[PDB]
Design a binder for these strands. Structure first.
Ligand SMILES: [Mg+2]
Ligand SMILES: [Mg+2]
Ligand SMILES: [Mg+2]
Ligand SMILES: [Zn+2]
Lengths: 94, 66, 176, 38, 141, 148
RNA sequence: AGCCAGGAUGUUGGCUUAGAAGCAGCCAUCAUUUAAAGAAAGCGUAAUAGCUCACUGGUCGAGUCGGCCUGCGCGGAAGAU
């Protein structure tokens, strides 16, 4: 049920990633299936509130990346070393 | 009575006063009369006699050194 | 807000006389009285007064709220009049009242003789009671306050000048 | 009254007030709880 | 009784109303008459039974004499002479030690019918559950 | 408090007493002690037990939410403090009687007994009641009529 | 939030104590009567007594409560010509 709007990443690398995080965005990646991986950028406070529920990690969930619905599962999360914020997520294609 | 390093053991409520029963050490009852008076506006008899020997608290014991 | 926002009736017989920022209010008894406001906007018309913020004072509202409240007690003041009521406690504690000065005997080596201010007057049902009526709420409070001060109630036998709606401590002494 | 650097409510009746520049504690039940330099 | 005024209850005894170390003086000394609880009590004593726990209230103002009232026995105590064990633990209630009579608890509670709120006399039982799970002593229901 | 799922029960329950009831009284319990309830529960007691109520609710918002049902004579009772009393079995009975006798033992006001519904109206203490079964007052109306 | 009311019965729960009666400790924390009322959140007591709270009924009449993240500030802050 979880609907995650997103955008393809136009910039990659340590430089951009940090920039994103200054603006309450944060990078993540969709990979899996037989098709290429995809570099995503997500709105932070949103995924935070969402991932507050345990279902986030169990349920299949959907990402609307430039109007598609990719539909994936949360593989891995990077939390901040000492804050309550998210750094990065691995999404597996289901 | 408690402050005086004392153990209490009963109360009756004998008629008008209230007899209070306690085991309290000797080296500690000195000048009771004087204060018992202050605490009860002068109206308070009391009485004591020997009962037993019990261990003296350490700081007491090590003080009692001749 | 709320207190600011609530209105306030002007009971039949009262004057009111705004002039800029200077309200004045006469009623039955009471020397009228006159306050000043600042970042408040006072609005007459009607059989009421109403208070609200003036453009450009971040202090507004809080100001209006006070304003409303003050004005109010003036109305209630100059109409019904205000209370008081003190009582002495302690052996040898007299009170007299000659005209507009209370004569107290509070166990000092001299009299006291406290002169009442202006719009306030005093009586003595017993030698151990003082009720003083007046219109100006701010002052009536002050004078009782002054009167209590000559001998604030001590907490061992409660001796001294009391209010009556007071609570007064009281602790067990503990010789010695 | 106690002065301290950390002040905080003690009783359920202690109240906390900012008078002048200074933070305070007033207890209507228990004089021991008055506090300043907050 | 639509107005309380003075009441101190310190469970007395029937067979002889004339204590002295337990109660004695302390049961009557502020406008109360030690002479009349052996004239009056025992007049309401022998009709029932004697010896066992009696809380009580009296009608003394400052009017010299008085009139004595009756009451009812403690309820967790009807689990002593009306159950088994007379203490309640022995192994502090870190251990669930006691032991119950399910048959009893109703009629032995019912004996206290005149001092309870439950309309349903079965309800008056359900109260005695906690009154008798006062230790954690299970009932062989 | 509870949400709606609970403000609805206090309704569906309390209004099916009106829909399936007998008599209604009145009373304002400013000073309502607990020796108060204690007693009146034994009275409900005599008056069956738990056949009776009094569920304080005079939130118009509650025990009027049961009125535009039946007894819309109570849009007028419901203001201020109130203690609504419903009857299921029993005569249109004595319920009436002791409320006046109770509150006339000080036992707080009685709302001047704003009254209620059997008819559709207002106030006045009646024992036009629990004579009920005083059909004997129509048995004695037999032999005495036959003889005299 | 104020203000009026109530804030109860088994019952001093049990244990433990000289006394533990909602309230020193230990274990339990149910059940009644209910509109609601803890086998009790604090004051108090030698212990009871006594005063409150939680909770509910009334009044009132539209907003209100408190955590998370952040910007700038407040106290903390005493020295010698
Ligand atoms: Mg770099
Ligand atoms: Mg100052
Ligand atoms: Mg400095
Ligand atoms: Zn305090």
């Amino acid at each position: 049920m979880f609907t995650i709007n997103a955008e393809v990443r136009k910039e990659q690398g340590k430089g951009a990633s940090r920039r994103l995080r200054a603006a309450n965005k944060f990078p993540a990646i969709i990979y899996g299936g037989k098709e290429a991986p995809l570099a995503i950028e997500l709105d932070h406070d949103k995924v935070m509130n969402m991932q507050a529920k345990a279902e986030f990690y169990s349920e299949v969930l959907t990402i609307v990346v430039d109007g598609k619905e990719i539909k994936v599962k949360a593989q891995d999360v990077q939390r901040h070393p000492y804050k309550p914020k998210l750094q990065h997520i691995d999404f597996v294609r289901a | 009575l408690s402050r005086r390093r004392g153990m209490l053991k009963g109360q009756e409520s004998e008629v008008t006063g209230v007899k209070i029963h306690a085991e309290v050490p000797l080296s500690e009852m000195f000048g009771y009369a004087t204060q018992l008076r202050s605490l009860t506006k002068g109206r308070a008899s009391y009485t004591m006699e020997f009962l037993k020997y019990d261990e003296a608290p350490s700081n007491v014991a090590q003080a009692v050194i001749e | 807000s709320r207190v600011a926002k609530a209105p306030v009736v002007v009971p039949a017989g009262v004057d009111v006389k705004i002039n800029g920022q200077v309200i004045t209010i006469k009623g039955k008894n009471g020397e009228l009285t006159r306050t000043l406001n600042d970042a408040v906007e006072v609005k007459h018309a009607d059989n009421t007064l109403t208070f609200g913020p003036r453009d450009g004072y971040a202090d507004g509202w809080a100001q209006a709220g006070t304003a409303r409240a003050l004005l109010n007690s003036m109305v209630i003041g100059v109409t019904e009049g205000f209370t008081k009521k003190l009582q002495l406690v302690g052996v040898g504690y007299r009170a007299a009242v000659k005209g507009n000065v209370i004569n107290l005997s509070l166990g000092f080596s001299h009299p006291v003789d406290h002169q009442l201010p202006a719009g306030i007057t005093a009586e003595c049902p017993t030698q151990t009671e003082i009720v003083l009526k007046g219109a100006d709420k701010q002052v009536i409070g002050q004078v009782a306050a002054d009167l209590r001060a000559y001998r604030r109630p001590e907490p061992y036998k409660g001796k001294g000048v009391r209010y009556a709606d007071e609570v007064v401590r009281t602790k067990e002494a503990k010789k010695k | 009254m106690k002065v301290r650097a950390s002040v905080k409510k003690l009783c359920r009746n202690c109240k906390i007030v900012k008078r002048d520049g200074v933070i305070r504690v007033i207890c209507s039940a228990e004089p021991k709880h008055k506090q300043r330099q907050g | 009784a639509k107005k309380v005024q003075a009441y101190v209850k310190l469970q007395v005894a029937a067979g002889m109303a004339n204590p002295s170390p337990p109660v004695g003086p302390a049961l009557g000394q502020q406008g109360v008459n030690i002479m009349e609880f052996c004239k009056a009590f025992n007049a309401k004593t022998d009709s029932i039974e004697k010896g066992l726990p009696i809380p009580v209230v009296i009608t003394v103002y400052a009017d010299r004499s008085f009139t004595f009232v009756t009451k009812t026995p403690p309820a967790a105590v009807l689990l002593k002479k009306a159950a088994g064990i007379k203490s309640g633990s022995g192994k502090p209630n870190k251990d669930k030690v006691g032991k119950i009579s399910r048959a009893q608890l109703q009629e032995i509670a019912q004996t206290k019918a005149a001092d309870m709120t439950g309309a349903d006399i079965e309800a008056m039982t359900r109260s005695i559950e906690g009154t008798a799970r006062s230790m954690g002593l299970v009932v062989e229901d | 408090m509870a949400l709606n799922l609970q403000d609805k029960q206090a309704i569906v329950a309390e209004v099916s007493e009106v829909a399936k009831g007998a008599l209604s009284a009145v009373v304002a319990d400013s000073r309502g002690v607990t020796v108060d309830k204690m007693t009146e529960l034994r009275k409900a007691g005599r008056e069956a037990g738990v056949y009776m109520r009094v569920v304080r609710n005079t939130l118009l918002r509650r025990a009027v939410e049961g009125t535009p049902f039946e007894c819309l004579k109570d849009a007028f009772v419901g203001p201020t403090l109130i203690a609504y009393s419903m009857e299921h079995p029993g005569a249109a009975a004595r319920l009436f009687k002791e409320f006046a006798k109770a509150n006339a033992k000080f036992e707080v006001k009685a709302a001047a007994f704003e009254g209620e519904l059997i008819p559709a109206s207002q106030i006045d203490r009646l024992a036009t009641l629990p004579t009920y079964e005083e059909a004997i007052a129509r048995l004695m109306a037999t032999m005495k009529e036959a003889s005299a």
